[PDB]
Design a protein around this ligand. Structure first.
Ligand SMILES: *[C@@H]1O[C@H](CO)[C@@H](O[C@@H]2O[C@H](CO)[C@@H](O)[C@H](O)[C@H]2NC(C)=O)[C@H](O)[C@H]1NC(C)=O
Ligand code: NAG
Ligand code: NAG
Ligand code: NAG
Ligand code: NAG
Ligand code: NAG
Ligand code: NAG
Ligand code: NAG
Lengths: 361, 254, 50
C-alpha cells in the first residue's frame, strides 16, 4: 500500500494495491484423432524397385506426414539433408510430397546432391540448385545381391545433351559418339546406352548396392494438405489451466456442460464474442469455459499514526480460491466479522464496513 | 462415349422468387439466444433466381458461371440430380471437378478431364449407362464421402470459393409443393471443406436420363446467386439459426 | 582450401544475446543417444568452411 501510494505514511481508508489472478497450473494441448497415416509402406518398403533413369514418382498427398518412423529407422544407412532441418520435419506443412525411388551403387550416393556432376546426374536424374528434401538410403546386400546377376536395374550412361532439372527419359535411341552415320543401327562407333549394374556377392564395401528413395517438397500457393503429426495430451477439468483446443489458446476453467452443440460446432461464443464453450475434439464433449478467479486486491488499513494492522479484501473472489469472511464484495482476510452494527468507517461494499477498535467487519 | 441429343424442344427458362430461403451458417461457432450480425457472401432475400425444368420434352443443361458463389436448390424425387461439375474450361486444358452419386458412394475427384458437350447418366426401366467423359488423362486430388440423398425432399446447396476452400453447405428440408418454394425458414448446416486451391469460374449439373427413346422425369431445380452483404441471424436457445434479416433488403430490415 | 574457421551448425537450444557457446561436445541428432561417441546421426558441432 505504501509502495502503490508512493508514501511512507498511509491515511485510514481502503486502497486497491494489486490484482489477484489464479495462475494456470499446466498447459493443455489437444487435437482431433490421429488417423489416416501416409502409406509409406508401399513406397519406401516395397518389393521391386526401378532403374535410376526410370524412377517411380509417387505422390504423397492429403495425409499426416509422420517422419519419426522414417528418421529413427536403423535399417536406413544414412539420413542426409541439404536445405531442411531433419528434427523440424514434424512441425512442417506442404502442399504435396514427391516420393521418388531408384537404385544406385555405393559410390554413386554422393552424386545425389544439388548440382553434382557425375556419371548418373547428367543423364539419369539431375537436381536444381536450390533443392529441398532429405535423402534416405540403405545397403541392400541381403536381397539385391544375386550370384546369377542383378541386371534388372539399369542406368542411362550417355545421351546427346545434359539433363534439365527433374527430367525423366524413357527413350531407347542409339548413342552417336562419332561422326559415323547411324540410323538406329549399331556398328563400330554406335552402341546401346543403357547398361547393367555390377551387384555381386563377392563385392564388399564401396562396391555394394544402395537403394535410394528421395522425398521432395513443393510449397506452391495451394493449401497445405500435407502436414505433420499433432500431439494430444491429457484433459483436465475444474482446474484453472491453459488450454489449446485446435488453436484456440487461452486460460480458463473447464467443466462439464449441458449445452447442446450442433453436430458441426466446435466453439461457443457469448453475446460479447468471447469463447465460453468448446467441443472437445478427441471425445465429443462440451466444456464450459469459466474465467479464472481474477479480481482486485484492496488493503483495508487505519492510519499508520494509529496501527500497522491491515485487512485484505479480494474483490469478487470466493474465499476457497485464495479471520476469513465471505462478503458479497469478495473474500475478506484479517478482519473479524462482529455481529454489532456501527457507523461506516471504512466501506467494503454490499453493506459491510470495516473499523479499528484489531480490525473488525 | 459422348452422344449428341437431336430431340431438343425450345422453350424459355422460368423464374421465381427466392423467398426467405438460402440462409447458411457463416462459421462453426455455437451461439444461443444472441442476435449475431455477420458480413458474408449470402443469397439475398427475395432475389431473382433462375429456374430450369425437365419434363416429358425439355432438357435444361446449361453451363453457368460460378461468379463468387452459387446457391442451388432442387425440389426433387427419384434422384434425377446425382452430381455436379466444376471447372473453368472442362476440357484437357484446365483442371475440373467431378461429383457423381450412385449406388456405391459419392465420388469427388479433382481431375483434368475432357468432358463431353452433354454429359449425363442413365436409368433404363438401375444404372448401366456410364457416359460422362469419353476419356481420362490425369488426376491430382480425390475424395470419398457418403451420399447426401408431389416432391417431398428439397435439397438446398450453397457453394463458395475463398482461397480455394470449396465449402459445401446443405440441409434436408421436407416440402409438399410440386412446383414452387415453400414458405418458411431453414438454415443450411455445413458438410465439408475442400481446400483444393485451383481456378473455378463456371459449373454444370449432371442429370440422370431415363429410358422407357430417352425418357425425361419431372424435375425442377434452381440456381441462385450469392452476393456480399450483411445479415442479422437470430439464434435460438438450442443454437440453430431460426430467423434471419437482410440488412440491405428494405429500410425496416436495415 | 582454408579450413581454420568453423561454425556451430547444430545446437540443442537457442542462444541468448551476447552469450557465447564453446562447449565442443557431441550433438544427439537422433532418438538413439550418441553415448558420448561419434557415430550414426552424430557429428562434430562445428563444421569447417569450404
Ligand atoms: C455434340 O454437338 C456439339 C455441338 O453441337 C459438338 O461440338 C462441336 O463438334 C464439332 C465437330 O467435331 C467441332 O468442330 C466443334 O469445335 C465442337 N464445338 C466446340 C465448341 O468445340 C460435339 O462434338 C458433338 N458430339 C459428338 C460426339 O459429336
Ligand atoms: C516399412 O516401412 C513402413 C513405414 O511405416 C512400416 O510400416 C513397415 O513395417 C516397414 N516394413 C517392415 C518389414 O518393417
Ligand atoms: C477418437 O479417440 C477417442 C479417444 O479414445 C475415442 O474415444 C474415439 O472413439 C475416437 N474416434 C472418434 C471418431 O471420435
Ligand atoms: C429476373 O430477371 C429476368 C431477366 O434477367 C426477368 O425476365 C424476370 O422477370 C426477373 N424476375 C424477377 C422476379 O424479378
Ligand atoms: C458407381 O460409380 C463408380 C465409379 O468408379 C463405379 O466404379 C461403380 O461401379 C458404380 N456403381 C455401380 C452400381 O455401377
Ligand atoms: C496430363 O496427361 C497428359 C497425357 O494424358 C500428359 O502428357 C501430361 O504430362 C499430364 N500432366 C500432368 C500434370 O500429369
Ligand atoms: C481462371 O479462368 C479465367 C477464365 O477461364 C481466366 O480469366 C483467369 O485468368 C484464370 N485464372 C487463373 C489463376 O488461372
Ligand atoms: C430445443 O430443444 C428442446 C429440448 O431440449 C426442444 O423441446 C425444443 O423444441 C427445441 N427448440 C428448437 C427451436 O429446436
Amino acid at each position: 500500500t505504501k509502495c502503490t501510494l508512493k508514501s511512507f505514511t498511509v491515511e485510514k481508508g481502503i486502497y486497491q494495491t494489486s490484482n489477484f489472478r489464479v495462475q494456470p497450473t499446466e498447459s493443455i494441448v489437444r487435437f482431433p484423432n490421429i488417423t489416416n497415416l501416409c502409406p509409406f509402406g508401399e513406397v519406401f518398403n516395397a518389393t521391386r524397385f526401378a532403374s535410376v533413369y526410370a524412377w517411380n514418382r509417387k505422390r504423397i498427398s492429403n495425409c499426416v506426414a509422420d517422419y519419426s518412423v522414417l528418421y529413427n529407422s536403423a535399417s536406413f544407412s544414412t539420413f542426409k539433408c541439404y536445405g531442411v532441418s531433419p528434427t523440424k520435419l514434424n512441425d512442417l506443412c506442404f502442399t504435396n510430397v514427391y516420393a521418388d525411388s531408384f537404385v544406385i551403387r555405393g559410390d554413386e550416393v554422393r552424386q545425389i546432391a544439388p548440382g553434382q556432376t557425375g556419371t548418373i546426374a547428367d543423364y539419369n536424374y539431375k537436381l536444381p540448385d536450390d533443392f529441398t528434401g532429405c535423402v534416405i538410403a540403405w545397403n541392400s546386400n541381403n536381397l539385391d545381391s544375386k550370384v546369377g546377376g542383378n541386371y534388372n536395374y539399369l542406368y542411362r550412361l550417355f545421351r546427346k545433351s545434359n539433363l534439365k532439372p527433374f527430367e525423366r527419359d524413357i527413350s531407347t535411341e542409339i548413342y552417336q559418339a562419332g561422326s559415323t552415320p547411324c540410323n538406329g543401327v549399331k556398328g563400330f562407333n554406335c552402341y546401346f546406352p543403357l547398361q547393367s549394374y555390377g551387384f555381386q556377392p563377392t563385392y564388399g564395401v564401396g562396391y555394394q548396392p544402395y537403394r535410394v528413395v528421395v522425398l521432395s517438397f513443393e510449397l506452391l500457393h495451394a493449401p497445405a494438405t500435407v502436414c505433420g503429426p499433432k500431439k494430444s495430451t491429457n484433459l483436465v477439468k475444474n482446474k484453472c489451466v491453459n488450454f489449446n483446443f485446435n488453436g484456440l489458446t487461452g486460460t480458463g476453467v473447464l467443466t462439464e456442460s449441458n449445452k447442446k452443440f450442433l453436430p458441426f460446432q466446435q466453439f461457443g461464443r457469448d453475446i460479447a464474442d468471447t469463447t465460453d464453450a468448446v467441443r472437445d475434439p478427441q471425445t465429443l464433449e462440451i466444456l464450459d469455459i469459466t474465467p479464472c478467479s481474477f479480481g482486485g486486491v484492496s488493503v483495508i488499513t487505519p492510519g499508520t499514526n494509529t496501527s500497522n494492522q491491515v485487512a485484505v479484501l479480494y474483490q469478487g473472489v470466493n474465499c476457497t480460491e485464495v479471520n476469513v469472511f465471505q462478503t458479497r464484495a469478495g473474500c475478506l482476510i484479517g478482519a473479524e466479522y462482529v455481529n454489532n452494527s456501527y457507523e461506516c468507517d471504512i466501506p467494503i461494499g454490499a453493506g459491510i464496513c470495516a473499523s479499528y477498535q484489531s480490525i473488525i467487519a | 462415349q459422348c452422344v449428341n441429343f437431336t430431340n431438343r424442344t425450345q422453350l424459355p427458362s422460368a423464374y421465381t422468387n427466392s423467398f426467405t430461403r438460402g440462409v447458411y451458417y457463416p462459421d462453426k461457432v455455437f451461439r444461443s439466444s444472441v442476435l449475431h450480425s455477420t458480413q458474408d457472401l449470402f443469397l439475398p432475400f427475395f432475389s431473382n433466381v433462375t429456374w430450369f425444368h425437365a419434363i416429358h420434352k425439355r432438357f435444361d443443361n446449361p453451363v453457368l458461371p460460378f461468379n463468387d458463389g452459387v446457391y442451388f436448390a432442387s425440389t426433387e424425387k427419384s434422384n434425377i440430380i446425382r452430381g455436379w461439375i466444376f471447372g473453368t474450361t472442362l476440357d484437357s486444358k484446365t483442371q475440373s471437378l467431378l461429383i457423381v452419386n450412385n449406388a456405391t458412394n459419392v465420388v469427388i475427384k479433382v481431375c483434368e478431364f475432357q468432358f463431353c458437350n452433354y454429359p449425363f447418366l442413365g436409368v433404363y426401366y438401375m444404372e448401366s449407362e456410364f457416359r460422362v467423359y469419353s476419356s481420362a488423362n490425369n488426376c491430382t486430388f480425390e475424395y470419398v464421402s457418403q451420399p447426401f440423398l408431389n416432391f417431398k425432399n428439397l435439397s438446398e446447396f450453397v457453394f463458395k470459393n475463398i482461397d480455394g476452400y470449396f465449402k459445401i453447405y446443405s440441409k434436408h428440408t421436407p416440402i409438399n409443393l410440386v412446383r414452387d418454394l415453400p414458405q418458411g425458414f431453414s438454415a443450411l448446416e455445413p458438410l465439408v471443406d475442400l481446400p483444393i486451391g485451383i481456378n473455378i469460374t463456371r459449373f454444370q449439373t449432371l442429370l440422370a436420363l431415363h429410358r422407357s427413346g430417352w425418357t425425361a422425369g419431372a424435375a425442377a431445380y434452381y440456381v441462385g446467386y450469392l452476393q456480399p452483404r450483411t445479415f442479422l441471424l437470430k439464434y435460438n436457445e438450442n443454437g440453430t439459426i431460426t430467423d434471419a434479416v437482410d440488412c440491405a433488403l428494405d429500410p425496416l430490415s436495415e
